[PDB]
């Protein structure tokens, strides 16, 4: 199972655990799974911006950015809205390094 978990792709909801997120219980009546799979997506409509790329190593940032964009959808009043990923100012490099820097001491 250790050799398994080194390699397979984890589901989106499960990758909250590296960053201690959790789905709130207010979202239990509503669907979330289709919104995560289809309505918070990366690589926006304007194309690449080079603050949008993530390396093939450490691709868990996609799944946490899913939670991030869906929280940004659900906090707004009105309908749920399709959201695409604008600039991140550090790159996937700097985001991965800062995430690893916090995960040094939990």
């Amino acid at each position: 199972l250790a050799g398994k978990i080194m390699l397979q792709d984890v589901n989106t909801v499960q990758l909250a655990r590296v960053v201690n997120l959790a789905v709130p219980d207010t979202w239990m009546s509503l669907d979330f799974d289709t919104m995560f799979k289809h309505h918070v997506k990366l690589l926006p409509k304007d194309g690449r911006h080079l603050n949008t790329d993530i390396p093939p190593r450490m691709g868990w940032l996609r799944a946490i950015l899913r939670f991030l964009g869906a929280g940004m959808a659900m906090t707004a009043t009105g309908v749920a809205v399709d959201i695409y990923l604008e600039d991140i100012h550090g790159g996937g490099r700097s985001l991965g390094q800062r995430f690893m820097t916090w995960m040094r001491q939990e």
Binding site: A76, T77, V79, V81
Partner: protein, 98 residues
Amino acid sequence: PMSTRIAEATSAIVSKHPARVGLPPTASSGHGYQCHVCSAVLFSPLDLDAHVASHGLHGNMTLTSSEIQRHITEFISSWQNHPIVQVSADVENRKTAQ
């Protein structure tokens, strides 16, 4: 009574008058009579508020009432665009029942 209030709420959420007419489009009879950045016409409320929003720069995008109402109008437009609810009825009409 309640049914009046819920009916007014339905008419508020469903009717911004985007209602479709069959005519040749004319430069006078446009919904965007005077767009308030540059005074053009675009014949539809969705393109009109897209015109109002696009002249604003995209780093200065703050949610407000008009920003909510654009998504409301787009949502209701696609819902009325769906055909099964284009042609539907809840109750009889003395001919279908007969």
